[PDB]
Structure formats: structure tokens, C-alpha cells
Design a protein around this ligand. Structure first.
Ligand code: DTP
Ligand code: DTP
Ligand code: MG
Lengths: 197, 197
């Protein structure tokens, strides 16, 4: 098919308002936008959770076919999970003037003690665009997993790719960044092992 | 150092949840203490958490025709970081008190895209961004006859599975729910088509 129809020019962001400002923000967008039928929308307002944007790193060891995961508590998981301690990808906020790659390498070093070799982009996704602006940009990074060493109270895990992917299937890994990265790895590891060796 | 293939909820003390903002959505300050990997308990920690409820997601897959049904609508929170705020997405809706994932998914497929659903199977249930929001989304794949789709301003698209996945690879589909669902389909479609035929 022919994909989406409209672009930014087809929407008028009339104004924004910050309804809550703390560590994060809750903003109200007021806007009008074009309709598929032709006309123009009424004035629309939407609450948006604003927390900046993140870089994510999947540490992959192509010699060993192993991944490095970081475990730490995420209290927001409490209400819908058996435990709020989650197995996750390395990640951090992108500050002004920083690149996805700069941040991913830095966080790999200070959350997992990992020196990263080559990187490659995986995917950049919107976490939940009905209610938050957050975008997370994922890279895969070449590591030697035998060197992983842990520490914000963080435990470092080394597991085989196949076990990590089985834990996605089983629900033991169930946060978006880690699901997306590990599904991508399951689709791309043959070529990635070919390339990095 | 690391762990090579822990805590439960008795190891966390939620002291308070302090309302920060109440509107359409909510922002709460969680105040809590938790067990530390090296022994003892943390001091009191506070985290701002976006509370917006939880969602059911349906990937409508026609296994006879190897086609997927996508829905297009504007999501203004995509504006700042995306080429366009109109997104191609899976069918989805909030789960209200007492409702099941399957009931919500089937209802939204009918109202959002005109589809009756035959068999379903679970894909995965994931936390969208658990550092800052409690939101969980539970994805099903639903058997549909893609030649019955039709159709808040929404436009329905019927595309080959291979095209929908190519759009994930190219960044033209880049919201978490649709990426996770279509990566899962690319890993499972051969067995799924055989099971449903
Ligand atoms: N991120 C969001 N996604 C979806 N709905 C949202 C979001 N933030 C706020 N809302 C709700 C709050 C309001 O009920 C509704 C606003 O819709 P809109 O078309 O702008 O005005 P309205 O006059 O229909 O609304 P109201 O129901 O408050 O009278 O959207
Ligand atoms: N959801 C969140 N994720 C990550 N950091 C968060 C989140 N919400 C708030 N923060 C940040 C903001 C503050 O730096 C800190 C929250 O307050 P808190 O844990 O009490 O530390 P603090 O810097 O205010 O010091 P003190 O312990 O002396 O009160 O964490
Ligand atoms: Mg960090």
C-alpha cells in the first residue's frame, strides 16, 4: 500500500501548557489537524507525559552468542507484575547535544562495566504515543560477555541469546526495550555473527 | 561480578502514593523502600509515575492471504520526534475494571476496523516504559478475513505481512505495540498460518 497520508504541515499546534512540572512534566497540547475526508478538525487537547528520550544498548557477544542484561527495581512495574525487579537493556536519557551512540556507550560502561566495540542501529520506537512523547533509540553493541561486572542498585546477568529469547516468550522479560531488542536479535543474529567475526 | 544462568514483593515497602496531578491521566509520587542486592534495605526513595491504565492490543492477521490490517490516526505526542504524527498502529483500547484482554481486543477490532475475529493466540504482554509509567499492554494475534475491513479520525489499511514488516525495518512503523507484534509475526507466521489452515 501507500503508507500514511498527512505530515506535520497538516497539523497546527495552537499552544502548549505545562500542567505539572517536577522531575518529569505533564503537558497539554492544543492543536488542529487535517481529516482523511478533507476538512479540518475542531480544536483538540491532549495530555502528554513528557520525560525526554532515551538511548538503549543491547550488549551482544557474537563469539559466545550471549547477551548482558541488567536487573534493577522499577517500582512502576509493581501493580501488574509478580516482581518489580526487571531484566533490562542498558539505557539512559539523551541530554542536549548528546548522540544516541555516545549515551549508549557511556551507560554500558557505568551500568555494566562493559567496553563496547562496534555498534549498529536496531530500531527507534515510540514507547506509547497515545499518552507520552518518549522515543527510545536502540543499538546493538559488541561486547565480550566474560568481562561483565556489576555495581541505583544494579545486578549484571550474562545469558545465552536463546535463553534470553525464551524468557521473552515466557514473559520473564517483558519490558518494551528488551522485547524489541531481543526479537530483533532473534531475526538478525546469524548475519550479525557473520559480520562481527 | 555477574550472574550466569531474586527478590519478591515482601522485599519492597510502598510507604505512600502521593497524588501529583489528576486529570484525564494521573501522575503519582511513589514513596518506597526496597531490598538491596548486597544486603539491607534502601532508604526512602521517591519516583514520579505516569498512571494511565492498561491496554489490550490486537494484531489482525489473515493467514489465508498473509495480510495484516493496520489503522492510521494522529498521535500528537509523536510530533516532536517523528517525521509525521500520523502513525500506523495495531487495534487497541483501554481495559476498564473487570474486563478481559480478549473482550477488549475483540470489541476494538470490531469498532475501530470493522473486523470480526475468529481464533486468537497470545503474543506477549509488556510494560511500555517502566522507569516512568505503570502502563502494561497485552497483545493478541487475531484471525481475520482481511477483505472485510472498513472503518476520532481513523483510516484502515490492508497490507501484505511482508510489507508491514518492511515498514518496521524502514522506520515507517515505529510504535512499540506494532513493532513487537510484527516482529513476533515475522518469527511465527509460518507455524501460525499452518495452524490456522
Ligand atoms: N493523551 C490523550 N489521549 C486520549 N485522550 C486524551 C488524552 N489526553 C486527554 N484526553 C481526553 C481528555 C478529554 O476528555 C478529551 C478531550 O477531547 P477534545 O476533543 O479535545 O474535547 P472535548 O470537548 O470532546 O472533551 P471533554 O470530554 O473534556 O468535554 O481527551
Ligand atoms: N520515575 C523516575 N525515574 C527516575 N528518576 C526519577 C523518577 N522520578 C523522580 N526521579 C528523580 C528525581 C530526584 O532526583 C529523585 C527523586 O527523589 P529522591 O529519591 O527522594 O531523591 P532526591 O534527589 O530528592 O534526594 P533526597 O533523598 O535527599 O530527598 O529521582
Ligand atoms: Mg541510566
Amino acid at each position: 500500500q501507500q503508507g500514511i497520508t498527512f505530515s506535520k504541515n497538516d497539523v497546527e499546534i495552537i499552544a502548549r501548557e505545562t500542567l505539572y512540572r517536577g522531575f518529569f512534566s505533564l503537558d497539554l497540547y492544543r492543536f488542529r489537524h487535517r481529516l482523511f475526508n478533507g476538512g479540518m478538525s475542531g480544536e483538540i487537547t491532549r495530555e502528554i507525559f513528557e520525560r525526554g528520550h532515551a538511548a538503549v544498548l543491547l550488549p551482544f557477544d557474537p563469539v559466545r552468542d550471549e547477551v548482558v542484561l541488567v536487573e534493577q527495581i522499577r517500582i512502576a512495574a509493581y501493580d501488574t507484575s509478580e516482581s518489580p525487579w526487571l531484566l533490562e537493556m542498558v539505557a539512559g536519557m539523551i541530554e542536549a547535544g548528546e548522540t544516541v551512540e555516545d549515551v549508549a556507550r557511556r551507560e554500558a560502561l557505568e551500568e555494566a562495566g562493559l567496553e563496547v566495540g562496534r555498534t549498529k542501529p536496531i530500531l527507534s520506537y515510540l514507547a506509547s504515543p497515545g499518552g507520552t512523547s518518549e522515543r527510545l533509540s536502540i543499538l546493538v553493541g559488541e561486547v565480550d560477555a566474560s568481562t561483565a561486572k556489576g555495581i541505583e542498585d544494579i545486578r549484571v546477568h550474562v545469558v545465552s541469546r536463546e535463553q534470553a529469547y525464551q524468557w521473552v516468550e515466557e514473559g520473564k522479560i517483558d519490558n518494551a526495550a528488551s522485547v524489541i531488542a531481543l526479537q530483533w536479535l532473534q531475526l538478525h543474529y546469524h548475519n550479525l555473527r557473520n559480520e562481527w567475526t
